[PDB]
DNA sequence: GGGTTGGCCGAGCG
């Protein structure tokens, strides 16, 4: 039916966001009664979920056996108005960058019902939004973040004057009486999830609807530091947590953490002592990886050397896995990472950046070919593993020619 | 503030 059930539901958002457009809340809460309760919402959220590789619960069930599906929708068809939240199944995801990250497993209907409120909050969440509001939006990369960084901070478009800050308390600390006071929802569902524990309580706010509400808190930011009636002092760029505030001194900066403080302090958060620094640039802040200064009235919006460092431990942790594998299997791994790291920045100043990552992941390449014959010469291993393809020799790739990819070829869009 | 290439000294024993 998946020809027509994303149709329908994307209509109704559309008339969701018009009726957020003008006032008519009546119209808003009146049609997310109708897609909360439509056919269509209900596929969408068993599809939603079945999608996200669903496990064990306390309350358990499954995915397949393909009627799981029509009768879960035809369950949820009633499950509005009995419609109980069990817990979370706290179990952790073992990762491996350092630690053993939590992650609450709530039960497949609560997912549904997640999934539809879900889908009933997107419209009125993307109208509501902040009009420099990027984090976790719909078509908002992290790097269109820098690109309102660069208009906001080009060629005296700011006056040389930002705030770093950053957010305490540490799961949905949010008061929950201001979340029942005004996110628009059918304050039931939301009643009972909120009681209910709903997102186990080692939470980053940055488990799909969660987003959606540290958004609708944090959206007041703009309009509210639009009372500095100023040219372009005060901007506000803000990724899903992180933001950085403009202007011209240290003590008009210090009127905006009055006020910030003051808008968070309505709800559960606050920007803390510690993290939030106010730091003239040219001295520089490290925004979503980037290093933002000035250099001399440039911008140079560089990836900043807690990105480079990160990158280079997943280059030295799987050359130190693949330790003695097949050559093929270093390129197969190291060629995503590389890429990855290359796609994320092959917008900004980077190319130098990118040589001084190649000369860095070179050298661990020397060191893999080098260990690996413990007493053959080095033109041996040289013209084993690294293979002549164009202009250049030192090419780590083999033989058609399967090679690494050079973060250095990534060809900057200006 | 985008492009392009370099790095490799040999030998014996285990
Ligand atoms: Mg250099
Ligand atoms: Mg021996
Ligand atoms: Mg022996």
Same mark, same amino acid.
């Given at each position: 039916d998946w020809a027509k059930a994303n149709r329908e539901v994307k209509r109704l958002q559309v008339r969701i966001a018009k009726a957020v457009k003008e006032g008519r809340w009546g119209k808003v809460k009146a049609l997310q009664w109708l897609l909360t309760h439509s056919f269509y919402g209900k596929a969408l959220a068993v599809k939603r979920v079945?999608?996200?590789?669903?496990?064990?619960?306390?309350?358990?069930?499954?995915?397949?056996?393909?009627?799981?599906?029509?009768?879960?929708?035809?369950?949820?068809?009633?499950?509005?108005?009995?419609?109980k939240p069990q817990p979370l199944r706290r179990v952790y995801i073992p990762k491996a960058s350092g630690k053993q990250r939590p992650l609450g497993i709530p039960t497949t209907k609560?997912?549904?019902?997640?999934?539809?409120?879900?889908?009933?909050?997107?419209?009125?969440?993307?109208?509501?939004?902040?009009?420099?509001?990027?984090?976790?939006?719909?078509?908002?990369?992290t790097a269109d973040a820098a690109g309102q960084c660069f208009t906001v901070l080009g060629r005296s478009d700011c006056? =040389? $004057?930002?705030?770093?800050?950053? @957010?305490?308390?540490?799961?949905? &600390? !949010?008061?929950?009486?201001?979340?029942?006071?005004?996110?628009p929802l059918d304050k039931e569902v939301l009643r009972k999830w909120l009681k209910s524990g709903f997102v186990w309580?080692?939470?980053?706010?940055?488990?799909?609807?969660?987003?959606?509400?540290?958004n609708m808190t944090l959206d007041g930011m703009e309009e509210l530091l639009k009372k500095h009636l100023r040219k372009q002092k005060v901007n506000l760029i803000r990724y899903a947590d992180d933001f950085v505030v403009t202007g011209e001194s240290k003590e008009t900066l210090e009127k905006v953490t009055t006020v910030i403080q003051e808008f968070l302090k309505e709800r559960g958060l606050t920007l803390s002592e510690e993290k939030t620094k106010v730091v003239h640039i040219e001295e520089g802040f490290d925004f979503?990886?980037?290093?933002?200064? =000035? $250099?001399?009235?440039?911008?140079? @919006?560089?990836?900043?050397?807690? &990105? !480079?460092?990160?990158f280079h431990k997943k280059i030295r942790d799987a050359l130190k896995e693949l330790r003695t594998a097949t050559?093929?299997?270093?390129?197969?791994?190291?060629?995503?990472?590389?890429?990855?790291?290359?796609?994320?920045?092959?917008?900004?100043?980077?190319?130098?950046?990118?040589?001084?990552?190649?000369?860095?992941?070179?050298?661990?390449?020397?060191?893999?070919?080098?260990?690996?014959?413990?007493?053959?010469?080095?033109?041996?291993?040289?013209?084993?593993?690294?293979?002549?393809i164009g202009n250049r020799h030192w090419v780590f790739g083999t033989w058609r020619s399967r090679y690494l990819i050079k973060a250095g070829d990534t060809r900057i869009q200006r």
């Open positions: 079945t999608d996200n590789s669903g496990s064990k619960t306390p309350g358990v069930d499954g995915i397949t056996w393909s009627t799981q599906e029509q009768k879960a929708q035809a369950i949820k068809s009633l499950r509005r108005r009995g419609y609560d997912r549904a019902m997640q999934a539809l409120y879900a889908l009933a909050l997107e419209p009125v969440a993307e109208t509501t939004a902040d009009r420099n509001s990027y984090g976790f939006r719909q078509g908002r990369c006056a =040389k $004057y930002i705030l770093d800050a950053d @957010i305490t308390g540490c799961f949905d &600390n !949010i008061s929950h009486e201001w979340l029942l006071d005004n996110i309580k080692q939470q980053l706010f940055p488990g799909v609807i969660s987003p959606m509400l540290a979503l990886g980037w290093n933002i200064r =000035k $250099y001399g009235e440039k911008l140079l @919006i560089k990836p900043a050397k807690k &990105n !480079i460092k990160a050559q093929e299997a270093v390129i197969d791994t190291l060629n995503p990472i590389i890429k990855g790291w290359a796609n994320y920045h092959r917008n900004q100043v980077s190319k130098r950046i990118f040589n001084r990552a190649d000369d860095n992941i070179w050298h661990k390449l020397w060191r893999w070919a080098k260990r690996r014959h413990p007493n053959k010469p080095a033109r041996w291993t040289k013209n084993k593993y690294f293979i002549k």
